Design a protein around this ligand. Structure first.
Ligand SMILES: *CC(=O)N1CCN(S(=O)(=O)c2ccc(OC)cc2)[C@@H](C(=O)NCc2ccc(OC)cc2)C1
Ligand SMILES: *CC(=O)N1CCN(S(=O)(=O)c2ccc(OC)cc2)[C@@H](C(=O)NCc2ccc(OC)cc2)C1
Lengths: 244, 246
């Protein structure tokens, strides 16, 4: 299995999306040895090593090059330690909501580029191709993300002729890939209290069944409350959009 | 640049190969993807110009996507993308002390499960939501029906989990400028560039009415969220209070 032109010329290189966290490093890990571990992926960008704690950061060229380095070097033995290679979180990512119509990735990137250099901008799209009203804007550095978050909350940032300001907020970063493995679970007393009963269906008649059926009725109660608010919001937004 | 190296041939490694030439054959598909090892199912809509091919691992599909995307093939440029999962489920109201292995073990009673993830926040805590990926639609259908009829309990705490179809959202491709239809309403909306509403204009007054309405939506949502959390507390305290049954 060989490759070479592992690049997409349209998008930038050495962004935060290609920065890898490397844990469980040997005590005397050097910056040159760290680069030599990743030298097969071409030249690396920013490399930091905290030699005491045994962790480090390395910035590869492209995102797909880092995904190859992750699955190849994760859990790899190196002088008595199993290396932990994960993708670092993005330090300057923003969530954009209330997007108007006819907004693309390029327009979203062009719009927020006035606050600083932008690495990536996405208009989140459903399974059928239409936008969901939400988007992602990733800046190269924290100051550009701080400026975009402050100005868009104070003033009204308009992307199109439609004078509805977009809402900017920090990206709620959720890990739906690594999750919570069994070895990372806290094995305490409340652990074994819940783990006493295996996964099962509640037997009709027991205390579990009656208590769970009240939860199902309560969850259905929550759905009726939320869906009532959703219809109230739509009628309120159609009221403002009606007047001129 | 040499590579060497878990469940194999899951839906996570199925690639959509679109914009195919008319005379595309099945052995030609396995010829382009032959450097990535032996492949699984190779479907070809031999009249619509698209198809699917499943590779061994997710990594072998990640590498194959960037190499064979926009590759010339008899006058046409290929469009290689990851196919969507046809049997993914969202599990909400997860109890505490639930791991990825426990979630996979639990829902395996409905059929073959490929992957199960307990969604975790940025601080290492479970968000209460989870993902369950079955190998096929029938297994996901049984999990959805059974968990809505009866109460499926994963731990000792008698709170049933909620199983709903996965709402698949694309935050990688997004919406490029090419896909936007260049109609008259498009140009009408693009007359004004991205800008801040300057005070005094008509768009500034109308925009302030929107920020006021958005704030009212924030208070309405937070009022419901407090009414839901406290109502759940009115039920969680009745656990051991009513456990004195017999
Ligand atoms: C989602 C998030 O914000 N996180 C989780 C991931 N990490 S980490 O990969 O650096 C990490 C920390 C500790 C650890 O031992 C238990 C294992 C992994 C954090 C993160 O990625 N922050 C982003 C960031 C910002 C600036 C810099 O400067 C180079 C690097 C990374 C917190
Ligand atoms: C998220 C989603 O549901 N999608 C987006 C991805 N595609 S596709 O790129 O494969 C595609 C198919 C047909 C088409 O019209 C010519 C254009 C694009 C879809 C998808 O992958 N669905 C999942 C799926 C289910 C079953 C099978 O084979 C049995 C393949 C794929 C829709």
């Amino acid at each position: 299995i060989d490759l070479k032109n592992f690049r997409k010329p349209g998008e930038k290189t050495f962004t935060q999306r290609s920065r890898l966290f490397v844990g469980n490093l040997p005590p005397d890990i050097t910056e040159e040895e760290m680069r030599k571990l990743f030298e097969k992926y071409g030249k690396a960008g920013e490399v930091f090593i905290h030699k005491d704690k045994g962790f480090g950061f390395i910035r590869l060229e492209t995102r797909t090059l880092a995904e190859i380095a992750k699955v190849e070097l994760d859990n790899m033995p190196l002088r008595g330690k199993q290396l932990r290679v994960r993708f670092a979180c993005h330090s300057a990512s923003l969530t954009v909501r209330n997007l108007p119509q006819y907004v693309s990735n390029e327009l979203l990137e062009e719009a927020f580029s006035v606050f600083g250099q932008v690495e990536r901008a996405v208009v989140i799209v459903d399974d059928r191709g239409r936008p969901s009203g939400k988007g992602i804007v990733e800046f190269s550095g924290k100051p550009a993300a701080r400026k975009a978050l402050d100005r868009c909350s104070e003033g009204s940032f308009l992307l199109t002729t439609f004078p509805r300001p977009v809402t900017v907020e920090p990206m709620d970063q959720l890990d739906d890939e690594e999750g919570l493995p069994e070895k990372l679970v806290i094995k305490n007393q409340q652990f074994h209290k819940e783990r006493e009963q295996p996964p099962r269906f509640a037997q009709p008649g027991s205390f579990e069944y009656e208590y769970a059926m009240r939860w199902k009725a309560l969850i259905e109660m929550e759905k009726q409350q939320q869906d009532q608010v959703d219809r109230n919001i739509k009628e309120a937004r159609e009221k403002l959009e009606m007047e001129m």
